[PDB]
Design an enzyme around this catalytic site. Structure first.
Site, short mmCIF file in Angstrom:
data_model
loop_
_atom_site.label_atom_id
_atom_site.label_comp_id
_atom_site.label_asym_id
_atom_site.label_seq_id
_atom_site.Cartn_x
_atom_site.Cartn_y
_atom_site.Cartn_z
CD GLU A 45 0.47 0.84 2.78
OE1 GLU A 45 0.12 0.21 2.13
OE2 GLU A 45 1.61 1.60 3.09
CB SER A 46 -3.99 -3.71 7.95
OG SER A 46 -3.28 -4.90 7.38
#
Lengths: 278, 278
Positions: A45-46
């Site tokens: 994830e970002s």
């Protein structure tokens, strides 16, 4: 331009735990751009830090390389830790799709080293696919009931009779692919100290480092099945077999029928910092 | 004899939300009898659980005290929650006049506490009776466009500039009676969190507790008018002013011209259980 950091969530040492990229001052990025940047980074994830819209301290959007998530544990822990570099507040209130998640930040000389979150309260039921799942894992039976929990993602828990047996697992990842929109979390331990391995073709992970959104459910599972009490904390060590050891602390307060808090905490550390050109 | 329960839909506490009576094993009741029983009960709806005819899990017929409905949100949510007491399945497929509506059930220790449905995709247009409606409500203007949505029932949405202004509304219920086959839904809020009040002389309600079939449309309305994005969930709190607080969660995926899913979810709780003599 935007600044970012890479936080290893559920670790105090770089190259341990679960990396998340955290992008600051993201209000000028449309969501399609956020998704592109998450694809570019290719981390599990970002996150993107936005101005709050409902009284919190910030609004956090969470993206895998291919979709937006309503909730994710390690990425939110890493975001809290990264943001706490820019605030003096002790508590941080992060707005998400599931509502505002409250964090307590823990510092040493101004650096945030750890945080604790109140997670969404999960729901759960029997998986009802035991023989198929056990086949896929390569084992004959679970210790405890094979139940699936939902708190945004879904996690299934399969119990092993010793840590050595957990480590010995060699799942058929192809056979696990028939388990859609869930992760398979195998566990072993005793008392305060548990070990976990998580596999999820559905979520695009061969084997995870720290499944933060499974830590809360696991505490509930262990309390319901009599291995700990409600209100007692557990330490969950995950990721050892992939060399990303990750330490998650969890506690489920109340009782099964009326849970009042699902707390998950951990350390985090900065791996890197940089700037992007858009 | 038949067994029934009374479910408070869009609530986790009894005496909150919107009650529905759910009658089990109803295959021996002709529809005229179902209508009589709905009149007897006098709840805003009674539902009747019948054997499926098109591959679903059950066929649900929905009755007000005076007619049969093709679709209704709170009554179907309450029926799913009530039925989930008698199944182990995670998903429930309920046949209706508008087709089969898919539910996801959420449990804790075998009790269904919440569910999520995919609603019919609405259509909408400008009401084109703005001055008359605003007069009836006692206000000068709407925030957002006054549009009417259809998903079986019809709902009109009128926006207020603050929650205090919404609460202050004192509509002329007589003047609202000139608005046939629709409900008037007034709303206010920001970000993830919205408030609603619904009035409908046409549907025989002075002020509603939870207008489940308006929650989906409201998410669309807010996305189209830029207050949220498509794909973002909202929490809609309704019924506070009548002491039946009701919490509806909604999300509209796609875009205005090509909506792919209209999801509405909520808690439910059992208020009572009994048996009738026919």
């Amino acid at each position: 331009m935007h600044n970012y950091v890479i936080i290893d969530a559920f670790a105090s040492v770089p190259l341990e735990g679960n990396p998340v990229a955290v992008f600051f001052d993201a209000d000028d990025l449309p969501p399609a751009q956020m998704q592109r940047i998450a694809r570019e980074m290719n981390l599990s994830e970002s996150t993107f830090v936005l101005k709050p819209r409902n009284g919190g301290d910030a609004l956090i959007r969470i993206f895998t390389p291919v979709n937006e998530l309503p909730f994710a544990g390690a990425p939110l822990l890493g975001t809290a830790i990264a943001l706490g570099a820019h605030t003096d507040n002790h508590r941080l209130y992060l707005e998400t799709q599931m509502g505002t998640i409250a964090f307590e930040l823990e510092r040493q000389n101004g650096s945030v080293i750890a945080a604790s979150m109140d997670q969404p309260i999960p729901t759960w039921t029997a998986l009802g696919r035991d023989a198929e799942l056990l086949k896929a894992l390569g084992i004959s039976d679970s210790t405890f009931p094979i139940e699936i929990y939902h708190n945004g993602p879904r996690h299934v828990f399969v119990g092993l009779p010793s840590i050595d047996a957990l480590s010995a697992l060699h799942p058929d990842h192809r056979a696990l692919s028939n388990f859609h929109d869930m992760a398979i979390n195998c566990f072993a331990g005793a008392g305060r100290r548990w070990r976990s391995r998580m596999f999820s073709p559905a979520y695009g992970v061969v084997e995870d480092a720290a499944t933060g959104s499974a830590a809360g459910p696991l505490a509930i599972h262990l309390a319901r099945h009599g291995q700990i009490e409600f209100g007692q904390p557990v330490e969950i060590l995950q990721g050892v077999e992939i060399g990303r050891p990750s330490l998650m602390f969890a506690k489920a307060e109340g009782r099964a029928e009326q849970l009042t808090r699902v707390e998950v905490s951990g350390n985090g550390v900065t791996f890197g910092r940089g700037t992007i050109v858009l």
